[PDB]
């Protein structure tokens, strides 16, 4: 049966099932204003599904220069051609090397660069932007956006949005490391996943994928969503609450002083964003500190709502192209105010 919503992290996350129901609002606002993150899923069966693959990104944009980020030791690969890292995307054995002549796991930096998006793109900005689930908050013009209504005591959000575009982790190795890193948003921000690749070559990776998902903390209706419905998962987050943000810089500062890293006591570890939470780190956070966050697996289509202050890290499952758009609810406005 077709249900409006469900419950997920035990009840600690709301998972909205039709993203045009004109009725989401009641649900949404009430989940909102307590500060947590919200998922609504079937974004996918809205878009059209020719203009999110990466074949096309190649064809059409392909000879623009841009830098490329090695995710496992974090070196920047300059000034190479936007297809180097599109022909990769899927296919292994056409990935560029590292020294030890392994294939890099790689993210594209930057692209669309600052807010060119509507510009080069403007089928692509024309479909998402009409299809973006609770429009009111949401659209560059919605009743519940203060975005373009604020003064200058407000730190206002960037036109968007920006597509985040990268390779999956691989190896028991790449457990540990982040495809972003720890970091908050002073703005909301909706991420929709638009397109997952799920490799060949060495396509037979499925089981890597379960352990990551299992020892990442995923709640037991999340793995259900494989192995019942075959949907495809793109990335794992770690979200935490805007009120425990201190916290976790204790936590880090504490962790960087065991590590011999040499720091003043006031630098920001989170602004930072050279950290990725592993299994040890998470569960100190838990244990020492008194910290739970929500694990939450972002499948094809899903919608991932995280609220302005909220520390957040993504780890790729597989290959991803994400889309994301940034607003100002009512509920969260104080996390952009420049006084006291
Ligand atoms: C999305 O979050 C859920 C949470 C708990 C149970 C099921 C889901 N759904 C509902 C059906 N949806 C589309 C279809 N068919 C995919 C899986
Ligand atoms: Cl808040
Ligand atoms: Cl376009
Ligand atoms: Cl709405
Ligand atoms: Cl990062
Ligand atoms: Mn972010």
């Not at 500060?35 to 999110?52: A, D, N, R, T």
Request: net charge negative.
């Amino acid at each position: 049966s077709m249900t409006s919503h469900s419950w997920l992290c035990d009840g600690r996350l709301l998972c909205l099932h039709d993203p045009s129901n004109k009725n989401n609002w009641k649900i949404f606002r009430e989940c909102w204003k307590q500060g947590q993150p919200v998922l609504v899923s079937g974004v996918h069966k809205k878009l059209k599904s020719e203009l999110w693959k990466p074949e096309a990104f190649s064809q059409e944009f392909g000879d623009q220069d841009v830098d490329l980020v090695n995710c496992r030791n974090c070196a920047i690969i300059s000034d190479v051609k936007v297809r180097d890292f599109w022909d990769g995307f899927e296919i292994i054995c056409k990935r560029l090397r590292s020294e030890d002549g392994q294939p890099m796991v790689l993210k594209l930096k930057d692209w669309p660069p600052g807010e060119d998006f509507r510009d080069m793109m403007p089928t692509r900005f024309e479909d998402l932007m009409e299809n973006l689930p609770l429009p009111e908050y949401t659209k560059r013009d919605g009743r519940l956006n203060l975005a373009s209504r604020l003064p200058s005591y407000f730190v206002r959000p960037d036109l968007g949005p920006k597509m985040y575009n990268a390779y999956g982790l691989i190896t028991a190795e790449d457990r540990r490391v982040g495809t972003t890193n720890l970091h908050l948003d002073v703005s909301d921000a909706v991420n929709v996943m638009v397109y997952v690749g799920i490799p060949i070559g060495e396509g037979a990776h499925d089981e890597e994928v379960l352990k990551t998902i299992d020892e990442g903390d995923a709640d037991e209706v999340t793995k259900e969503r494989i192995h019942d419905h075959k949907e495809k998962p793109g990335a794992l987050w770690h979200i935490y609450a805007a009120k425990d943000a201190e916290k976790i810089r204790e936590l880090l500062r504490k962790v960087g002083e065991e590590q011999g890293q040499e720091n003043p006591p006031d630098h920001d570890p989170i602004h930072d964003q050279s950290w990725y939470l592993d299994q040890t780190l998470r569960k100190r956070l838990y244990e020492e500190y008194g910290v739970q966050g929500w694990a939450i697996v972002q499948f094809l289509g899903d919608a991932v709502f995280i609220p302005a202050g909220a520390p957040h890290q993504v780890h790729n499952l597989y290959s991803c192209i994400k889309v994301a758009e940034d607003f100002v609810s009512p509920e969260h406005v104080k996390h952009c105010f420049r006084l006291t």
